[PDB]
Amino acid sequence: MENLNMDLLYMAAAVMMGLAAIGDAIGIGILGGKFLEGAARQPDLIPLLRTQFFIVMGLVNAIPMIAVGLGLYVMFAVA
C-alpha cells in the first residue's frame, strides 16, 4: 500500500493544516468585522475598511482553499 496508507497519514496532516489555516484565515476574517467598529472612528474609512475587508474575505477563504486546494490536487495526482 504505497497509495493506500499514505493517503490516510496525509489526511491527518492536511486535515490538521486545514484547522490551523482556518484559524489564521479566520483571525483576519473576524478582524474585518472587528474593524468596522474600529474604523467607525473615522467616517473617511467606511468605504475603505469595507474595501480592504471584502478582499480579505476572499483572500481569507483563499488561504485554506489554496492550502487544501494544492494538497488535494497533489493527492489526486499521485493518488
Q: Which CATH number does the domain housing residue 67 bear?
A: 1.20.20.10
Angle at which helix 5-39 crosses helix 46-77, to 10 degrees, equals: 180
Residues with Cβ within 8 Å of residue 12, at least 6 apart in sequence: none
Other beta carbons within 10 Å of 25:
21
**How far, in Å, CA of 18 to CA of 25, rounded?**
10
Q: Which technique? A: NMR
Q: How far apart are CA 17 and CA 73, in angstroms?
A: 15
Give the chain's domain count: 1
Range of the domain at 9: 1-79
Distance between CA 79 and CA 76 in Å, rounded?
Answer: 4
